[PDB]
Every structure is written in C-alpha cells, then in structure tokens.
Amino acid sequence: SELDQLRQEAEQLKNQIRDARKACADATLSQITNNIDPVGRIQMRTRRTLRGHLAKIYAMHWGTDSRLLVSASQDGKLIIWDSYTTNKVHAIPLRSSWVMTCAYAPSGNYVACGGLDNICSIYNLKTREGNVRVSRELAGHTGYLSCCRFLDDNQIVTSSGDTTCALWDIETGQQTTTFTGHTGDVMSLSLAPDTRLFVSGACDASAKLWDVREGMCRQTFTGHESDINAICFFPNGNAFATGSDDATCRLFDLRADQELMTYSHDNIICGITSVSFSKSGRLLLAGYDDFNCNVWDALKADRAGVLAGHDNRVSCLGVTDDGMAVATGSWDSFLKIWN
Amino acid sequence: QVQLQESGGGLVQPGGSLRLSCAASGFTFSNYKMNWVRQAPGKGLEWVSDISQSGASISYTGSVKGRFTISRDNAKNTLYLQMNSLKPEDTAVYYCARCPAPFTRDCFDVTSTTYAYRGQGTQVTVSS
Amino acid sequence: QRNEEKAQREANKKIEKQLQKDKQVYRATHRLLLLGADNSGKSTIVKQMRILHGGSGIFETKFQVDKVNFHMFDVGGQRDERRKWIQCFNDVTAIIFVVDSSDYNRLQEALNLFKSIWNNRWLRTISVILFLNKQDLLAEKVLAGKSKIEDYFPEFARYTTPEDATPEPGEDPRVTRAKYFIRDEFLRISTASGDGRHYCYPHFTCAVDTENARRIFNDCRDIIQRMHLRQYELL
Amino acid sequence: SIAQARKLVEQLKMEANIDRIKVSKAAADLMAYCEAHAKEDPLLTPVPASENPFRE
Amino acid sequence: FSVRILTACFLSLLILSTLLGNTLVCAAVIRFRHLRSKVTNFFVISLAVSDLLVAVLVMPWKAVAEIAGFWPFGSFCNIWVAFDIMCSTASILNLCVISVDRYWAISSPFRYERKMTPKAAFILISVAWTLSVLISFIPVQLSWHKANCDSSLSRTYAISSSVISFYIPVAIMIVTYTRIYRIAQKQIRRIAALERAAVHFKRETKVLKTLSVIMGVFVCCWLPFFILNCILPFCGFCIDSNTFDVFVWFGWANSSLNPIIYAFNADFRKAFSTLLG
Ligand SMILES: Nc1nc2c(ncn2[C@@H]2O[C@H](COP(=O)(O)OP(=O)(O)O)[C@@H](O)[C@H]2O)c(=O)[nH]1
Ligand SMILES: NCCc1ccc(O)c(O)c1
Ligand SMILES: [Mg+2]
C-alpha cells in the first residue's frame, strides 16, 4: 500500500530533521553567556491596583501609548483603564460572558474580544454618537477563540480551539486566510514586531511559525512535554519564548530552528500561564499557576526576581511598549501594575 | 517531541495471550499517569486501563477486569499490558495514551478523533 | 487640563455605579454548568426547563424558583477535547452531570469523565449534581432481561441493594438494584476523593420530569449551606 | 489517514529545506541585542522616581 | 510585694495581649482589602475595634488603681465608669450580631445573599454601637447608675443594663447556636448516609468542639460577672471587692480572647503570617 510508505518516509524526514538540528548545536547558550554579569536582584513593587472586575480575568493588553489597557473578565465585561490614574475609561458589556481574550488595536481605535461563543467581536471606542457599541463580529470558527491580535484597524488574526488560526478582513467579515496544521487546541499567538510573521503555541505541545501573507507554516518547533499555554516574541524578532503546562519555559531561535535555552526549577511544578519579554529582552516574565510571577534573566536562565502579589492563578501579563511597567491579571479579578 | 511507540499484538486464537509494550520517548516518564485506550472496529474509542504515576493505584474497565494486567517500569521507560484469556471481542487497536498534564490525577484522553499525546496502535486481532 | 481630570473622574463615577448595579445582578444569579456525555440528555433537560418555567437547546436557560434566579448553560459548539475550555467554569455554583443510566456500555465513559471532573485541579471546589437520567428506559431494559449489567460491571453480580433505598410504589427489586448500583458507582468515586470541599447529590430523574427545577433549587441551597458551614468550621 | 499523511509529508518537506545558522551565532546575536539596549530598559535599570510615571 | 508585682505583670500581660491581638486584626483588615470584601468581616472588624477600645480605654486605669491601691485620677473616673459600660456592652452586643449574622447565612442562604447588603451590615453595626453608647453614657451623666471612686451600680440600673447587655445577647446566641447545631447535625447525618452507601461521629465531634469553644468561652467569661452584677448591689451570701474585681477581669479577659476565636479563618491566618513573618 501507500499510507504505510508515507508514514515511513515521514519518519525518515523526522530523523533527517533531528540530525540537521543536532548538526547546528555546536554550543549551548549557557556556555556562551556564562561570562556575562547577572542582572542582579530585581524587586518590582505594585504601583497601582485596578479593581472593578466581578469575575476572573483572562486577558489583558497594553495599548501602544503604554498608558491605557483593556482587561476581560468572566462577568461579561471588558474594562479600559488609564493605568496612570486608575480611572476607568470604558466598561464594555459583552453579549456572552465567557470571554477568553482581548486585544488593543495599535491605533487605539478598537478593542477586540471573543470566547466560548466562537465569535470575535470588534468594538469601536471612537464612535460618533457617544457610547461604545459593537462594530464588527466575526463568525466562522467551530471552536472557542483563545487569542487574537490586530495587525491594523482592518486586519485581525485569531486563534481557535478548532485547531486553526485565521486572518480576517474586519470589513467584509471573511476569513481572508486560514492557517491549519495544529493537532490540538491553539492556545496563544504572538505577532512579530513587523506584522510579517507570527507564531502560535498549541495544545499538541508544538509551536508553529506562520507566514501571514502566504498562509503557510514555515517552521515547527517542539520540545515541550505538554500543552503550550503562552508565547511571545523576542523584541529583536529572531527569537521567541514559550511556556507550557509542564512547568518550563523555553527559548527558541527562528534562524537556528531549534531550542536555545530552558528556564525551570525543580520547585516549580505548576503550569505557566503567560510569558512576556522586557523592552530590551533581557528580562523574561512568566506567570505561573502558583499565584506568583517569576522574572528570569533571559540570557543566563537564572531566576532573578519574583512578583508575588496575587492570591490566585495569574492568568495574563504584558509589558508596556516603553518598558516602563508590567501588568499582571489573575483570577482574583484584579490587575496589578509593577515597576 | 513526545512520541509513544506500542509493540506486540497479532493474530491470536481465542483464549490465547499477548503482551503490548508501550515505550515512551520525549518526556519524563515518572510524572505522567498512563492509560491503555483500545478502539474496536466499528465503534468509538474505548478506555481499557490506567496506572498511576508509580504503579501505586491501578484501575481497569469492567470488561477486562480480572484478565489483563498493566505494569509500569520507569527505569526502562515503558509500560506493559499483559493480556491473557483473550475473547473474540478483544480485537481492537490498542493506543497507549498519556494524560496531558504531569503531577495530577485527571485526564481527558479518549477523544473521538485527535489527541496529541497518544501513540499509533497495534491492531490486536482475535478470531477463529 | 484639570477639566480632563474631572471628565475622567465623572466617567469613572458613571462606570462605577453601573458596575454596582451589575454587581448586584451578577451576584444574585446562580450559574449552573450542564456537563455529561452525549446521548444522555443535557439538551433535553435545558429544553424542558425552557418549556415549563421559562428562559432565553441553546447554550443557556434562565429560570427562577422561589424568587431565586438560575442560569444553566450547556456547551454545544465545541470539539470533543475539554481540557482547556473547562477552566472557563471554575466558579460555577454547581455542575449538573447528566448520565444515561440506561446505556450499559457508555457508562464507563461517564464514570471516567466524572472522575476527571472531580479530581480536576481547577474544579476541586465545584460540587456536582448527578442526574441518573432515562430511568424509564432503564426499567424497560431491566424488565426485558436481554442486556444484563453483569456483563459490563461484574461487581454487580455480588451487589446488594442498600438498606436505605427508597423505591417508588410498584418497582421491581431488579430495577432498584440496577439504578442504585449506578448511583453507588458514582458515589464511590465522589467519596473516594472527598476532602469535604465539595459533594455529589444523586437524583434519579427522567428528563421530562416536572420537578427538575426543584431538585436543582434544593441542591444549590444545600451547596451554599454546606459552604457556609465549612467556612465557620461548623461542618 | 492518507490525506493527513500527504499533508504531513508535504509540510515536513517544506520544513526540511530551510537553512539554519550555527547556535553560536544565534546566541551571540541575542547577547548583542541584549547588551546593546540594556541602558534603555526601565525594568532592568530602575529609573529614578522623578521620571517614574507610576510613582506620584 | 511579690504578689503585688505579680498582679502587675499579669495585668500588663492582659492589656498587651488584648492590644496586640486586636490591633493585629485591625491592621490585617485595613491593609488588605480582600479581607474587607465580605460582610461577616465587617462585623468581625466591629468586634475587634470594640475590644481595642476595651483595652486602651478601660483596662489600664483599672489595672493602675488595682496595683497602686488608690484611684489616682479623680474627676476622670465618672467618665471612666461610663466608658467601661460602653466598651463591655459594645463587646457582647457585637458577638450577638456576629452570631445572628452566621445564622442568617446558614438558615437562609439565598435570602442572605440577597438582603444582607453592606447597608444592612452598617445598620446592624450602628445599632450595636449606638445601643452601647446610649445605655452607657446617658444614665451615667444623668447619675442614674449610682444608688478611690465608687462604681457600685444602682439596684435598678444594674439589673436593667445587665439584662440588655448580657442577656439579650445570651439568648440570641444560645437560640442561634442551637439552631445552627440542629442544621449542621442534619447535614452531617446526610453526608454520612451517602458515604456509608458508598463504602458498602468525627464531624459531629467537630461541630460540638467549635460551638462549645465559642459559646463556652463567651459564657464562662461573662456569665459570672453578670450574675454578680445582678446579686451584689441588691444584697450588699455576699462577696468582697477582690472577687468582684477578678470576675470583672474575666470579662475583659474574654475581650482579650475574642480575636483568636473569631478571626482565625484561613485568610486571616495567612495575613497574620505574611505580616509578622
Ligand atoms: N425516552 C427518553 N429519552 C430520553 C430521556 N432523556 C433523554 N432522552 C433522549 O436523549 C436524546 C437527546 O440528546 P441529548 O443528550 O439531549 O443531546 P446532547 O446532550 O447535546 O448530547 C433524545 O433523543 C431523547 O430521546 C428520557 O427521559 N426518556
Ligand atoms: N465591667 C463591665 C461593667 C458593666 C458592663 C455592662 C453593664 O450593663 C453593666 O451593668 C456593667
Ligand atoms: Mg447539547
């Protein structure tokens, strides 16, 4: 037959790939960076505390001005905050209370959100009659929407539990591009700083780099033992970090096409929920299930500081674009700003 | 990359015997609860037996209770389902599934079509 | 620029007072998640609740018993994996687990799903209301005597009907033993884990039953009572 | 199945013909971008409270 | 003298223990807003504040007068005796409220979650504190309580105030806790039925231990003082000033013990542990 011969040639390719991967592993990142000086103890403190949410927070995203931010709670709300003064700028009620993600358009004109309704809803904050209302609403997914991020005010990429990601044209409401190939539920995506590529971490313990304009998967990275829960890009664009349920963070490089470094401790046995780099990429912040956030030195794999301020699982995080502060959302219905 | 390879299992007359060896590569074997999920021809996935993180607590589906045993060896990184007194209805593919999270006691791995942490199957056939 | 500070302050005031009314409404709605295998009846119970009492097959139903509001939701439009969207329901008041008690071979699937829900790290405190549905079909199969329980659960051969059983008037002891056996297989799991943080309340419903509401009301009340007890260590 | 196998093989053939660089250079590039921007990272080098927008 | 210095050190320990426990409760509440979130916690804060007032206002002056033997404050002590009655009636009353609170949250959980809004919590706290302030100050400044500075209460003020404070609270707290016990016993029997079915009086002992600790500490600390406050001014079979003084101190000892028995929920424990270390 032919299915078993394609399965065999598949395994042959997988071993040629493993050999081509061990071929470029001439050194390790730790040996190269062993002579650098450590970042030192990093003790950030809560500068603001943002209250108001009636349920567990699931997503947050700073704006480009690094001042406003949106947070999504399971009371059916999406609150926009002026993080400097802790005032609430908007409180958007949702037709479905099971929201799971939220993004902030780089123009500050739109917020997005979606969840178990399998629908991505875009809301125009700069409406002309007075009050924020629904502007677009994207249907087509057969699974729950786990993450979404704007490219511009008219293009938006979504990740869903039907094991697919999709690039949408908000006006026509059509999926202008579909990304398939993941086996498990896609949990997180992160767009490259130039909108040109984006990576995705799925529940099949794999991350995939996708070409936005062509709809093809360029590179697939593995190494995690369990579900990948969070992902982000290195500020340079040629590296990215992943966090998974096996209580480990891993730094992969795009051009070398294999894992570079692993961040773990034998006293942390909980599933990583969120990851994000600092402005310079020297610090990697990760949110754990044990209610804490660990700040790792992205070059030496040593753990440097902790942000112990939540009383329940930290569900999300994000660093400002100016690097001035990091926010952490948890299932206690509170957001906390750190710097 | 997590991958699970099962082996053993062929045409065996009723009342025979077999031993299915599932070798795991790509993670830490000790942390994960392991299961044996069988699929008979023409029916959905069925769950056969599970063994805990260290062979402490074992449990079986009713139909294979008192016939099969399941042993875990973390040293050689494998587990074995020793089947004896096979019936004409034990003919099925036998995936060796791993629960998707370490250090826990729950899992959801009998999924209808696609689960990412189970092997490929060794079609055990039993007929006269 | 102080004017913009006062505009932000009064926008925050209108927001906070809308959020206060929303807090009282959300605080007074009792969310109930309906879970269970298919061919069991989740949708039929939502529909029959929407027929008699009222509400908004659709994921949700909203009904009131004695001035107490409930919102019951069954998720229909997902895949078959549930290890990640299940955590969207870690704060529900109770999970209504529906099990086709008359389906002798998909019962192991229901037991495994109940075990995975009961020992979930994120659902450790969510109590489950067990509906052993389709009792009329179970009586049909037991009286027919064509498919016997011993072929799927050999323990059933040595099982004795409990001395605390309350059969309805005119019930064959075989039917009592079959439905109380399914009851005890799920109670053996719920008490095998325990820890007193949550409990399982079995109820032998048929979906078209009029009282399903009352049973949920009575039990949500018991769950809150026991939560308040275990809070003051009185339990 | 046969369709998922043709898609897996074509995906692996596409992924196979990529060109990889040495890990030594990828790490040297990460180290260079890190130390090249260290002085502009407020979370790494703490900014005086006068220029901290979240402190008064 | 050895006995006198011993009384001094024990009294200082009592004041310091009351102050430390109650200021710890008040600090864990004021600093952490997630403890102030609930409503039962409002009542616990009221109790803690009442006991801190008991300590700082009433205890040290009585301790000084007990050590030195003569009351060295003179014109103050009229105010003082009023202060005493308020703070002590602000304690017992508050306990009553907390008890009633728990009852509503176990006998009617739905009605509780609907009607007990922070407005009702504040109304109850206000009623307790204002009943205290009224019943204490108003009959003092009008010299109705009088039949070293004398504090022997009039034969009627005594019995009446005694009733309001101690007794209303004891009846409400005995009725409430016996009802809560009936309810907990019912639920225990039911869970035991289910567990015995599955397997085919430890939780009862736990209920008894917790209810007995609460009610018995309250009673064994206050009841002797109030049966004395009843019997003593009428007959003064009779007792002496030293015995009456030790039973007063028993009352303020309860005012010291209230924090560890009413503010050792898990979150309170963890807030204390992360504060002190
Ligand atoms: N005869 C009978 N059938 C029932 C009863 N409850 C549920 N069913 C059957 O269950 C089916 C409903 O499927 P359902 O479980 O609601 O769909 P799902 O929950 O989305 O998987 C219907 O075809 C009913 O015939 C019952 O009490 N009696
Ligand atoms: N040391 C407390 C004295 C006191 C307190 C309350 C009363 O009602 C009373 O008659 C006497
Ligand atoms: Mg349904």
Cross-strand bridge partners of residue B79: B22, B72
Buried-state track C11-24, b at ≥16 Cβ within 10 A, e below 16: bbeebeeebeebee
Among residues E139, E63, B66, which one has the least CA distance to residue C157? B66
Q: How many CB atoms lie within 10 A of CB A322?
A: 15
Tokens of C87: 């955590």
Nearest to A63 by CA among A44, A77, A84: A84
Beta-carbon contacts of residue B37 (< 8 Å; ≥ 6 apart): B45, B46, B47, B48, B94, B95, B96, B97, B109, B110, B118
**Residue C37 Cα, ligand 3 centroid: separation in angstroms?**
9
Residue environment code for C49-59, b if the CB has 16+ CB neighbours within 10 A, otherwise e:
bbeebebeeeb
Q: Cα torsion for A152, A154, A157, A160, to the nearest 10°?
A: 140
User: C76: number of CA atoms within 13 Å, CB side?
Assistant: 13
Q: Domain A2-338 has what CATH class?
A: mainly beta
Cα(B13)–Cα(B87) distance, integer angstroms? 9
In whole angstroms, how far apart are CA B77 and each of B85, B95, B103, E79? 27, 17, 17, 81
Tell me how far apart the terminal alpha carbons of chain D are, to the nearest angstrom.
63
Backbone angles phi, psi at C72, to 5 degrees: -105, 130
Task: List ligand 1's pocket residues with C-beta within 6 A.
Answer: C 38-44, 76, 133-134, 136-137, 206-208
Asked if residue C136 lies in contact with residue C206, where contact means CB atoms within 8 angstroms, the answer is yes
* Contacts for A202 with CB less than 8 Å, ≥ 6 apart: A163, A182, A183, A184, A185, A186, A187, A208, A228
Rounded CA separation C99/C202 (Å) = 11
H or E element that contains E111? helix E109-115
Work out whether strand B69-73 and strand B58-60 pair parallel, antiparallel, or are unpaired: unpaired
Structure tokens at A171: 């006006």
- CA–chain centroid gap for E130, Å, is 16
> Measured from the CB, is residue E58 less than 6 Å from ligand 2?
no
SS3 sequence, chain C?
CHHHHHHHHHHHHHHHHHHHHHHHHHHCEEEEEEEECCCCCHHHHHHHHHHHCCCCCCCEEEEEECCEEEEEEECCCCCCCCCCHHHHHCCCCEEEEEEECCCCCCHHHHHHHHHHHHCCCCCCCCEEEEEEECHHHHHHHHHHCCCCHHHCCHHHHHCCCCCCCCCCCCCCHHHHHHHHHHHHHHHHHHHHHCCCCCCEEEECCCCCCCCHHHHHHHHHHHHHHHHHHHHCCCC
Q: Which residues contact E212 (CB under 8 A, 6 or more apart)?
A: none
- Resolution for this PDB entry, in angstroms: 3.1
Strand arrangement of the beta sheet that strand A99-104 belongs to: A99-104, A110-115, A120-124, A133-138
Which residues make Cβ contacts (< 8 Å) with residue E219, sequence separation at least 6? E170
Q: Method used for this model? A: cryo-EM
Q: Identify the sign of the CA torsion C103, C105, C109, C112.
A: positive
Q: Among E248, E194, E253, E265, which residue's Cα sits nearest to residue E38?
A: E265
Break chain D into its structural domains and give their ranges.
1-56
For residue C19, the distance in angstroms to the closest alpha carbon of chain B comes to 37
Asked if C106 and B43 touch (Cβ cutoff 8 Å), the reply is: no
A83 bridge partner residues: none
Distance (Å) from the C-alpha of residue A185 to the closest C-alpha of chain D?
17
Q: Which of E102, E180, E198 sits opposite C191 (nearest CB)?
A: E198
Is-contact A70 A111, C-beta < 8 A? yes
Is the Cβ–Cβ distance between C127 and C200 less than 8 Å? yes
Q: How far apart are CA C187 and CA C173, in angstroms?
A: 20
**Domain edges within chain B:** 1-128
Give the ligand 2 atom nearest the CA of E145. 10
Compute the nearest-CA separation of A299 from chain C (Å): 31
Q: SS3 for A264?
A: coil
CA angle E92, E97, E102 (to 5 degrees): 125
Residues of B in contact with A205 (CB under 8 A): 1-2, 116-117
- Subunits touching C (CB < 8 Å, at least 3 pairs)? A, B, E
CB distance B123 to B8 below 8 Å: no
Q: Which of D5, D23, D40 is closest, CB to CB, to A256?
A: D23
**Structure tokens that stand for B80 in this block:** 């074995």
Q: What's the Cα-to-Cα distance from A319 to each of A52, D32, E94, E118, E186, rounded to whole Å? A: 21, 21, 47, 37, 53
| A26 at D interface, C-beta within 8 A | yes
Strand A77-82 versus strand A87-93 pairing type: antiparallel
**C156 Cα distance to chain centroid:** 25
Alpha-carbon gap, residue E13 to D34, rounded angstroms? 59
Interface contact C81-B63, CB threshold 8 A:
no
Residue A148, Cα to own-chain centre: how many angstroms?
9
Tell me which residue of A193, A183, A145, A185 sits closest to A166, measured CA to CA: A145
Q: Which of C32, C42, C62, C59 is nearest to C50 (CA)?
A: C62
Cβ-based neighbours of C20, under 8 Å, separated by 6 or more:
none
Amino acid at C130: L
Between CA A170 and CA E56 the distance in angstroms is 67
E119 close to A (CB below 8 A): no
Domains and CATH numbers, chain C: 1-232 (3.40.50.300)
Chain B residues within 8 A of A246 when measuring between CB atoms: 27, 102
Alpha carbon nearest to ligand 2 atom 1, residue: E248
With beta carbons under 8 A apart, name residues in chain D contacting A29.
23, 27, 30
Structure tokens at A150: 């704007």
- Residue B124 to residue B112: CA distance in whole angstroms: 20
Which of helix, strand or coil describes residue E101?
helix
* Whole-number Å distance between alpha carbons of E50 and E262: 13
Task: Determine the 3-state secondary structure of E191 from DSSP.
Answer: helix
Q: Is C201 exposed, middle or buried (0-12, 13-18, 19+ CB in 10 A)?
A: buried
Burial class (CB in 10 A: 0-12, 13-18, 19+), C229: buried
Question: What does the domain layout of chain A look like in residue ranges?
Answer: 2-338
Ligand sitting nearest the alpha carbon of C45 = 1
Hey, what's the torsion of the CAs at C221, C222, C228, C230, to 10 degrees?
A: -160
How many residues are listed for chain C in this entry?
235
CA distances from E143 to C165, E129, E146 (A): 69, 21, 6
Q: Report the run of H or E that residue E195 belongs to, with start and end.
A: helix E168-199
Strand partners, A287: A274, A293
Report CA-CA distances (Å) from E132 to E94, E121, E127, E159. 10, 17, 8, 16
The 8-class DSSP code of residue E129 comes to: H
Look up residue C157 and give its amino acid: A
Cβ–Cβ gap B62/C81 under 8 Å: no
Our answer on whether E and B touch (3+ beta-carbon pairs < 8 Å) is no
Phi, psi torsion values for E169, nearest 5 degrees? -60, -35
CB E139 within 8 A of CB E65: no
Which residues, in sequence order, are CB contacts of C47 under 8 Å at separation 6+? C57
- Describe the crossing of helices E77-107 and E118-141 by its angle, rounded to 10 degrees: 150
CA of A138 to the centre of ligand 3 (A): 23
- CB of D50 within 8 Å of a chain A CB? The answer is no
Buried-state track C145-175, b at ≥16 Cβ within 10 A, e below 16: eeeebeebbeebeebebbeeeeeeeeeeeeb
Pick the closest to residue A305 from A314, A316, A313, A297 (CA basis). A297
Task: Give nearest CA residue, ligand 2 atom 4.
Answer: E85
Backbone angles phi, psi at A259, to 5 degrees: -70, 145
Residue A81: phi, psi to the nearest 5? -115, 145
Going by the DSSP 8-state scheme, the letter that residue D47 receives in this structure is P
Cα distance between residue D19 and residue B67, in whole Å: 53
